[PDB]
Amino acid sequence: VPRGSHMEPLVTHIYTADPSAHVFDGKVYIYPSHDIDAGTPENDMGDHFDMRDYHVLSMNSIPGEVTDHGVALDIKDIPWAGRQLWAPDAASKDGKYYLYFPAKDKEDIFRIGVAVSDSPAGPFKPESEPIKGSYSIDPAVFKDDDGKYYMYFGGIWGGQLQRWTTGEYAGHDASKTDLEQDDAPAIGPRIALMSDDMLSFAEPVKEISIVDEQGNPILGGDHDRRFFEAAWMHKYNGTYYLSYSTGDTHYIVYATGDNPYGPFTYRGVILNPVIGWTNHHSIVEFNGKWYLFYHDSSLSGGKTHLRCIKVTELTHNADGTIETISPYIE
Numbered sequence: 278v279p280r281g282s283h284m285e286p287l288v289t290h291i292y293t294a295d296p297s298a299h300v301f302d303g304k305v306y307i308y309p310s311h312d313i314d315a316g317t318p319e320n321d322m323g324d325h326f327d328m329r330d331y332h333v334l335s336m337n338s339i340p341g342e343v344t345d346h347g348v349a350l351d352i353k354d355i356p357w358a359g360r361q362l363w364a365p366d367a368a369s370k371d372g373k374y375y376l377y378f379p380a381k382d383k384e385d386i387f388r389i390g391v392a393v394s395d396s397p398a399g400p401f402k403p404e405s406e407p408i409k410g411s412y413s414i415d416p417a418v419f420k421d422d423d424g425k426y427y428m429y430f431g432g433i434w435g436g437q438l439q440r441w442t443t444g445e446y447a448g449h450d451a452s453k454t455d456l457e458q459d460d461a462p463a464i465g466p467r468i469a470l471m472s473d474d475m476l477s478f479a480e481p482v483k484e485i486s487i488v489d490e491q492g493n494p495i496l497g498g499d500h501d502r503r504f505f506e507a508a509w510m511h512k513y514n515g516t517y518y519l520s521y522s523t524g525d526t527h528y529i530v531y532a533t534g535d536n537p538y539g540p541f542t543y544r545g546v547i548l549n550p551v552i553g554w555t556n557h558h559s560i561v562e563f564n565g566k567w568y569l570f571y572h573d574s575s576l577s578g579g580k581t582h583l584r585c586i587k588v589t590e591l592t593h594n595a596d597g598t599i600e601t602i603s604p605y606i607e
């Protein structure tokens with residue numbers, strides 16, 4: 278049946294989270310996390326999120342029937358992975374499709390791997406090792422207008438970004454949260470231009486600066502605005518929009534800049550807090566309308582780790598500002 282009409286769950290037969298939506302072959306393909314009721318301990322390191330595979334979803338229209346293409350990748354077939362298949366993303370180049378995914382290696386350190394297919398629906402064959410120089414979580418692979426592809430990535434707390442300040446993992450006894458200096462600039466998300474073959478980074482990883490309207494860095498203590506996880510890039514009017522989750526304050530927010538590397542100036546809220554702790558989204562144009570894909574814990578009755586994806590229309594103003602969405606008003 279058709280789905281996505283009135284902010285209802287897009288699928289109910291499985292739990293789904295962290296929707297990354299793309300337009301490939303005139304369809305919307307969605308690359309979400311596949312939530313399962315593992316019943317593992319819930320804590321601020323995210324051990325309750327113990328996902329083990331990915332299903333690709335597609336829609337020919339919004340609203341529309343949602344197709345579940347089955348298991349596109351299973352952790353049992355990823356040679357380097359130990360546990361926890363978290364939020365993935367996809368890219369298309371020269372007739373090949375690339376699924377990028379964060380997972381903990383055998384030493385319990387998050388890395389980002391790639392898997393390859395001839396179809397946007399998968400299934401995908403994983404590379405035997407993760408991307409060299411990758412770390413932390415939540416990749417968003419963005420194809421710019423000029424044909425260059427960039428990976429945005431990172432997540433603090435359980436995503437371990439705060440343990441990579443030196444370019445090497447600081448260890449399991451290092452910070453469980455952030456830099457632990459609230460008066461210093463907050464940790465920024467990461468960016469790297471992708472190699473021509475889409476399997477590696479083409480440059481040393483850069484950190485993105487996010488500033489307030491006065492041009493001052495967003496500080497570590499500013500949990501309402503500072504980067505937590507779920508980086509996403511889209512463009513409107515030639516302007517670059519870095520959006521992201523703030524985590525413990527439960528917002529999707531956005532910041533704007535004039536190039537992929539920033540700096541980005543904080544503008545405001547995309548999505549107010551939902552049912553359940555996490556908030557994760559993507560923003561995509563389809564048939565000349567812009568859509569915000571997101572999730573909540575509504576279908577499971579509020580369980581943090583059993584989510585469902587939803588969609589709603591997103592409105593840019595001509596000046597580039599975006600109207601804030603509150604999830605449960607209409």
Ligand SMILES: OC[C@@H]1O[C@H](O)[C@H](O)[C@H]1O
Nearest residue numbers: 326363364506507555557
């Ligand atoms: O859903 C698993 C993790 O929680 C957050 O939603 C984050 O963005 C993702 O990697």
Ligand SMILES: O[C@@H]1[C@@H](O)[C@@H](O)CO[C@H]1O
Nearest residue numbers: 320321322323434435436
């Ligand atoms: O620290 C984790 C974070 O990595 C994300 O998974 C959301 O849940 C928190 O507990």
Ligand code: NA
Nearest residue numbers: 417507508509
């Ligand atoms: Na994302």
Ligand code: NA
Nearest residue numbers: 545546600601
């Ligand atoms: Na606003």
